[PDB]
């Protein structure tokens, strides 16, 4: 009946329309702060000197961007990995010029999203569920840590963190390919197998269950009315679905066990995206994709180009053009 | 050595080509390495004074061993490919090099991450097992069926 | 957790077909355009502002500079029938690199 | 910014026409017995 006891009961209550919980106590203020700053900056922030060379890049709608080009621009290369909260600036005008909003957003976001993951554990415990949905979510979350925090740490600057915008995302990807040959890295290749395969198995599972729906409706009703929320019987015939797919390939290539099947559907994209995240997080320390430049040589010693050498030529074009005013010395060492 | 006055040399952006100021005023190396001004190392500290890199020491006191060390470290930067071709990603084959710092950092980030996953896996399982529902929901005692609707 | 949830299992599994299948179909339409060089290459308003105002920069203009490097540095070996010879002096490059 | 003068009407009708189509269908569903 004491206030702290009552408060704890409301916080951890399974009857709130949206679950709060103890992770929620951190998640809710941090995500609101990141969301509010992001929206205001995306609409109205002035240009940001991302590369620390007094060459401010315009990210906001009011300063000449559309939805595709706009961004919240990473903080200045002059800051590096230094902590740049609002109270470190002499003024909000300075804070904006130097990319302050970016640090505020990504730090509140990363904390809030980590708490989002813990909150998934927490509610599952309160509902008497098994606990590992939060483990599935760790794959996208690790990917966010990779591009907003780990890659900046390895390279020594939040100015190399992924920008908060659509074209800025493409800028990060192209420069990443120039500096790490990520396409030739096996962890990114596993990532592609993860998302291509995830999309494939998503369509596959969707089509197989849809194909074996038991007739419960008339020609004029949507078949979705054949399922009632919370009914005890399964709504499709997995024996028919397996009988179809096992004949499409061969019997043993198909799942008849729904638990095995759904475990596979969870594991394949999650594992692949884990390797994607580890790809970014280890190229953060410059262990890069395979380099077969000039690997094939004829009897005299003439280089015989392969498709790897053509990739290299494309990478070079990205390399020499990116941040065209920021390099004074011949090697791009970070 | 070719005769440049490195203190007064303005780079293309207007910042010093060789020397500039940190956001708090210290004299630091220019170009992209402005981000690395927190670096400290025994081959560089003889050049640093109370206000940062000291232009008089730079003009007069750089020893051959410092030039040697800086050339060595510049050309052994921790960058290289997974098949151990040293250099940037566009480098041609020739130098067999990946820094021990890259091997040690990448391996232990990979291991640390999977160990965080293992922590979540086993912490969530130990909680569910201690409460008695790690094998699934009891059909006759499904907690949510005993809760009021959300709406 | 999220605010919304599935409640109809038939809708859920149809949606799993719909989302990746529709996505692939859309990408196919774009590639049919690229067959004709009918690209979404530029935003004309961006180019007009950038051409007249040399202090105006966005991530969109930054990416086109990357594209211009890709074309110049990759075309001679990637398109050998064209017999491209681009003397060093014409190659687009930023400072130092 | 020198944007296309037809962009506004294009975006407005693109939203409004299918949106009102759905609202019409939804409301007459609600009003059924």
């Amino acid at each position: 009946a004491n206030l702290w006891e009552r408060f704890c009961n409301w916080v951890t209550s399974t009857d709130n329309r949206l679950y709060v919980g103890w992770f929620g106590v951190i998640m809710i203020p941090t995500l609101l702060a990141a969301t509010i700053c992001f929206v205001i900056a995306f609409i109205a922030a002035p240009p940001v000197d991302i590369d620390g060379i007094r060459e401010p890049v315009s990210g906001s709608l009011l300063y000449g961007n559309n939805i595709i080009t706009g961004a919240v621009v990473p903080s200045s290369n002059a800051i590096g990995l230094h902590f740049y909260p609002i109270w470190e600036a002499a003024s909000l005008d300075e804070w904006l010029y130097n990319g302050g909003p970016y640090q505020l957003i990504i730090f509140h976001f990363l904390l809030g999203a980590s708490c989002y993951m813990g909150r998934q554990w927490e509610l599952s415990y309160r509902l008497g569920m098994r606990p590992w949905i939060c483990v599935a979510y760790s794959a996208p979350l690790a990917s966010a840590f990779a591009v907003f925090l780990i890659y900046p740490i390895g390279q020594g600057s939040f100015s190399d963190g992924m920008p908060l915008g659509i074209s800025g995302t493409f800028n990060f990807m192209i420069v990443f390919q120039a500096e790490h040959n990520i396409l030739m890295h096996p962890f990114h290749q596993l990532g592609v197998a993860g998302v291509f395969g995830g999309a494939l198995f998503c369509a596959m599972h969707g089509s197989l269950v849809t194909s074996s729906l038991i007739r419960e409706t008339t020609e004029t009703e949507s078949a979705n009315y054949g399922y009632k929320f919370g009914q005890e019987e399964e709504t499709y015939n997995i024996v028919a679905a397996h009988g179809y797919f096992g004949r499409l390939i061969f019997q043993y290539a198909s799942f008849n066990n729904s638990r095995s099947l759904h475990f596979f559907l969870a594991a394949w994209p999650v594992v692949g995206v884990w390797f994607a995240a580890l790809g970014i997080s280890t190229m953060a320390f410059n262990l890069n994709g395979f380099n077969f430049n000039h690997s094939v040589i004829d009897a005299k010693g003439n280089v015989i180009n392969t498709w790897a050498d053509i990739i290299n030529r494309a990478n070079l074009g990205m390399e020499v053009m990116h941040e065209r005013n920021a390099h004074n010395f011949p090697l791009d060492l970070a | 050595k070719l005769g440049a006055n490195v203190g007064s040399a303005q780079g293309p952006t207007g910042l010093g080509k060789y020397l500039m100021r940190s956001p708090t005023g210290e004299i630091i190396f220019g170009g992209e390495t402005m981000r690395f001004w927190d670096f400290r190392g025994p081959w560089l500290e003889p050049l640093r004074g109370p206000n940062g890199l000291d232009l008089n020491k730079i003009k007069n006191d750089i020893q051959p061993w410092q030039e040697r060390r800086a050339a060595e470290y510049m050309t052994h930067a921790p960058l290289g490919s997974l098949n151990s071709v040293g250099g940037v990603a566009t480098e041609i084959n020739s130098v067999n090099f990946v820094s021990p710092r890259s091997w040690l950092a990448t391996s232990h980030f990979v291991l640390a991450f999977f160990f965080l996953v293992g922590h979540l896996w086993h912490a969530g399982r130990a909680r569910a097992a201690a409460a008695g529902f790690e094998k699934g929901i009891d059909r006759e005692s499904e907690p949510v069926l005993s809760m009021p609707s959300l709406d | 957790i999220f605010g919304i949830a599935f409640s109809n299992k038939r809708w859920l599994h149809f949606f799993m077909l719909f989302v990746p299948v529709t996505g692939l179909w859309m990408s196919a339409i774009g590639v049919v355009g690229l067959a004709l060089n009918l690209r979404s290459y530029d935003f004309i308003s961006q180019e007009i502002r950038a051409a007249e105002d040399p202090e105006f920069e966005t991530f969109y203009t930054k990416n086109l500079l990357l594209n211009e490097g890709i074309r110049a540095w990759m075309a001679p070996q990637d398109q050998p029938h064209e017999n491209f010879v681009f003397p060093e002096e014409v190659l687009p490059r930023g400072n130092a690199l | 910014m020198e944007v296309n003068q037809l962009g506004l009407i294009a975006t407005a009708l693109f939203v409004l026409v299918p949106s009102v189509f759905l609202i019409i269908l939804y409301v007459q569903t609600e009003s059924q017995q």
């Binding site: 329309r17 609409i43 709608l61 939805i67 919370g230 | - | 919304i4 | 962009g7 975006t11 407005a12």
Partner: peptide, 30 residues
């Protein structure tokens, strides 16, 4: 005009989130 248009569409989506969550068709066990 463009900025107003972009922010308007965004604002409608956020409003849609609110109604889709709090004014959803309630799931009923039948």
């Amino acid at each position: 005009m463009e900025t107003i248009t972009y922010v308007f569409i965004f604002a409608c989506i956020i409003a849609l989130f609110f109604f889709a969550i709090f004014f959803r068709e309630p799931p009923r066990i039948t």
